[PDB]
Amino acid sequence: NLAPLPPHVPEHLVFDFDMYNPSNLSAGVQEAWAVLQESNVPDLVWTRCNGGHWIATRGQLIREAYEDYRHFSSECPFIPDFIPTSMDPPEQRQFRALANQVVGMPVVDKLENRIQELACSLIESLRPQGQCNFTEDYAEPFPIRIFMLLAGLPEEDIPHLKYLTDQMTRPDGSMTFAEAKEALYDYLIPIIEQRRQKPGTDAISIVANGQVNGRPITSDEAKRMCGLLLVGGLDTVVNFLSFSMEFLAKSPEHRQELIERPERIPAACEELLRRFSLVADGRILTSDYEFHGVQLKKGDQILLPQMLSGLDERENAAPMHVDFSRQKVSHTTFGHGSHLCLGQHLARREIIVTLKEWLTRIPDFSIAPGAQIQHKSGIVSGVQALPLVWDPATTKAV
Ligand code: HEM
Ligand SMILES: [Cl-]
Numbered sequence: 001n002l003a004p005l006p007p008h009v010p011e012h013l014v015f016d017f018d019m020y021n022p023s024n025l026s027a028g029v030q031e032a033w034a035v036l037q038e039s040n041v042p043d044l045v046w047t048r049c050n051g052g053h054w055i056a057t058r059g060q061l062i063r064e065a066y067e068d069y070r071h072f073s074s075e076c077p078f079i080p081d082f083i084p085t086s087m088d089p090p091e092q093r094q095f096r097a098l099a100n101q102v103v104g105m106p107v108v109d110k111l112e113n114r115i116q117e118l119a120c121s122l123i124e125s126l127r128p129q130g131q132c133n134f135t136e137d138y139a140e141p142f143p144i145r146i147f148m149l150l151a152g153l154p155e156e157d158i159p160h161l162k163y164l165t166d167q168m169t170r171p172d173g174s175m176t177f178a179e180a181k182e183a184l185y186d187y188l189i190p191i192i193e194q195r196r197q198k199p200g201t202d203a204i205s206i207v208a209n210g211q212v213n214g215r216p217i218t219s220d221e222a223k224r225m226c227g228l229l230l231v232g233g234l235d236t237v238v239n240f241l242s243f244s245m246e247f248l249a250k251s252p253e254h255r256q257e258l259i260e261r262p263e264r265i266p267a268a269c270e271e272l273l274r275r276f277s278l279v280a281d282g283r284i285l286t287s288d289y290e291f292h293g294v295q296l297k298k299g300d301q302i303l304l305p306q307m308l309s310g311l312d313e314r315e316n317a318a319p320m321h322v323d324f325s326r327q328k329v330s331h332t333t334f335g336h337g338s339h340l341c342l343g344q345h346l347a348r349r350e351i352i353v354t355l356k357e358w359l360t361r362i363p364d365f366s367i368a369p370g371a372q373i374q375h376k377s378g379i380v381s382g383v384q385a386l387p388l389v390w391d392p393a394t395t396k397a398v
Pocket of ligand 1: 077083084085086096099103228229230232233234236237240278279281282306333334335336338339340341342343344346347
């Protein structure tokens with residue numbers, strides 16, 4: 001049900017969008033969100049759904065608000081306890097600098113070929129089967145195995161770790177949110193404590209032995225960081241790869257272009273990131289503030305969908321059209337401002353390696369005949385399942 005309209009909010013700005021259940025979902029997730037960009041919809045609206053909150057609908061406002069952390073705070077970033085997601089500068093800067101030591105560009109460059117080897121061996125074991133559940137069989141195992149590589153963690157721990165992180169996004173009832181969180185932390189603590197004593201060159205060891213505002217990081221702070229490094233690179237990557245593969249399976253022309261022109265693959269990656277953008281975070285007002293002619297009130301929540309900037313016709317012409325040759329690909333898929341994704345370099349490499357290894361070994365594939373692909377909408381929008389099929393005689397072992 002809807003929350004009653006706060007008196008400071010004018011009726012002409014009220015559009016009852018439900019971010020967890022948009023009405024045109026069956027047409028696809030990005031299409032469903034783009035209803036907010038129809039010409040009768042203002043740049044900034046209020047929805048009475050999910051407790052009541054603002055939505056900025058255009059790239060210009062989304063970028064501005066993400067820049068202005070003094071008015072738009074990350075203390076409450078979700079509608080309706082990881083570090084540094086809930087911090088503003090100044091305190092955020094220290095924790096962000098440390099996490100960048102574990103996923104930064106120099107780390108991605110060294111792990112580059114480990115990343116390719118993991119992709120090749122996952123794809124090679126599927127290739128002869130002529131079918132797969134892509135989300136289940138590749139999109140999940142690939143980033144979780146990269147995390148295990150990054151964090152120096154043994155391979156037998158994958159099923160249990162996959163289970164705990166599935167709870168935070170898709171609970172089965174076994175345990176509450178905080179219970180999945182604590183199970184995750186209980187897993188993490190001993191490994192953190194020991195790598196203080198004999199570190200490796202792994203991510204847990206670096207975060208465990210970190211210094212923050214002059215003094216050593218606490219076990220509490222370390223555990224809450226490692227947690228975000230795990231869950232931060234899962235949900236987004238799993239669901240983004242699914243969107244990308246869904247599109248390519250439905251578009252033989254786009255497959256052929258990348259097969260014939262493998263050098264376009266990094267550009268193609270950027271264009272898929274724009275077209276199948278998937279995050280919608282928010283901020284909370286620190287004070288009363290007039291924003292583009294609209295009176296915002298201290299404590300108001302505002303949804304700032306990273307998804308919508310690149311879909312905005314004011315940023316990219318014919319924004320639903322996938323064109324790998326756009327001279328200017330404009331998006332905020334990895335965010336904007338001081339929280340801009342620390343994993344953005346790792347994510348791009350994961351996407352690029354996936355496109356190259358898959359198109360090289362399984363160049364021709366389709367959606368399983370009969371199947372209708374179902375989507376979900378949220379803070380991270382996604383694909384529920386992606387059944388794919390191909391003819392093993394048309395593949396290559398490499
Ligand atoms: C397609 C893949 C990805 C997408 C679309 C994505 C998107 C985003 C966005 C929009 C934010 C900022 C959220 C906000 O301002 O509230 C963010 C932050 C973050 N991401 Fe990603 N991300 C991706 C992959 C990854 C990967 C692979 C990692 C590695 C573990 C990662 C780690 C992080 C971390 C640690 C932050 C927090 C930055 C901070 O608070 O200072 N991300 N991501
Ligand atoms: Cl699947």
